[PDB]
Amino acid sequence: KRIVLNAFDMTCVSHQSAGTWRHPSSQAARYNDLEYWTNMAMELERGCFDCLFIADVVGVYDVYRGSAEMALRDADQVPVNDPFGAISAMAAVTEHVGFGVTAAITFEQPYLLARRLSTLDHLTKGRVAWNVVSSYLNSAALNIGMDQQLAHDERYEMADEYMEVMYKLWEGSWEDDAVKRDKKSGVFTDGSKVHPINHQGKYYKVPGFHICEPSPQRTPVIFQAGASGRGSKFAASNAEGMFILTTSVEQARQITTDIRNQAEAAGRSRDSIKIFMLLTVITGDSDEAAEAKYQEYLSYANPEGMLALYGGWTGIDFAKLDPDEPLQAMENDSLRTTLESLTHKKWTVRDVIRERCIGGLGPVLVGGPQKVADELERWVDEGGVDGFNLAYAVTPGSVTDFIDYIVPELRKRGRAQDSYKPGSLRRKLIGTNDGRVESTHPAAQYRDAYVGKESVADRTQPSPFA
Known about the structure:
Organism: Hyphomicrobium sulfonivorans
Order of helices and strands: EHEHHEHEHHEEEEEHEHEHHHHEHEHH
Strand content: 5-15%
Structural class: alpha/beta
Family: Belongs to the NtaA/SnaA/DszA monooxygenase family.
EC number: 1.14.13.131
CATH superfamily: Luciferase-like domain
Binding site for FMN: 56, 102, 152, 156, 228
GO molecular function: dimethyl sulfide monooxygenase activity
Helix content: 25-40%
Radius of gyration: 23 Å
Number of strands: 13
CATH class: Alpha Beta
Number of helices: 15
């Protein structure tokens, strides 16, 4: 069973690690240079990585110390550029790697997001994934605006209808044989095979038809973050790739068993969702070299940068806490228990935060090729995940080191591909032969669902000019 390898990045400087952009090897500060992204995409194909997963936010981390100042000083997800920006340049110099693009449903109308994602599916020729998020950082709401007549109790009913609209536009609005592109007959599209979706739900009214012709995948690969409670049903119904945060192999066994139970509960197969976990790998020729590289990175750590990120991630303002108390005495159950699973307690909170300047809230794996490859196989086979969203401490070295030191060992163990399967990203990852959604995927119910329903031609009046 092949391990899926993804690079996790974001159009910003400090993503999952604080202060390590200061390292002489890091080009994190080039997030705003086109050459960083095109070099990254080409380097991913040298190692046959499946996908570049680009995160995004539109709010700032202003919880720690009550301001965004510490986040600005260590560039902790600010500044952040639009992750759609460099996709076409990266697709131009690559053939096979996919691009996961994060876009929130909170602020952008579905009709317009549908066109922006369809446009990327055209230009990349079927290599885009949509990471579906619901923005949560508070300054985004304040700076962009949210409609206050919407009950947040109903966010997932809202999110369901949002996706319904997207799936109708992408799958149902144009039939497969609408487009003719026929220079001799002069018919570009047959308007009797284009259909207004006539959507009118509780939250969205979209009467018209999609303004884009069918793209190679139609619906981009759906990526979603793992979630609990009500959000776990939303994720299990729609996700083709699910991005999870797990801190131990033991906890992963339950998370991935639960997700695949929820997939079946939604009418899908246990293997319909590919599960990717956050992981940071520091490696080298030996365990000793990997460890010295780890400590070298940590010497650049900015603990106040990781406290800004923690503040936004958990809501806890560490300026209210005590740096010298031991971890085991931390008040908050949820963070104390996750920090304890992440470290190997009697160390002060200060000592833990410094170590956590690499890895964020995800596990960190340090070792030479054997120890690293061993644990990667343990997460996949024992933990039940399908692969990894590999976060960086330094970039691009984190990806380059993985390719140089780990990929040859994974290939020798038969776990990593040494060439690409042809076709769309969905064909590569999910395996449908046409690169379209599985018939059990909720998008598939709009496929051909407007055949014989109202078309654009149905409204055409006579004309003396005809």
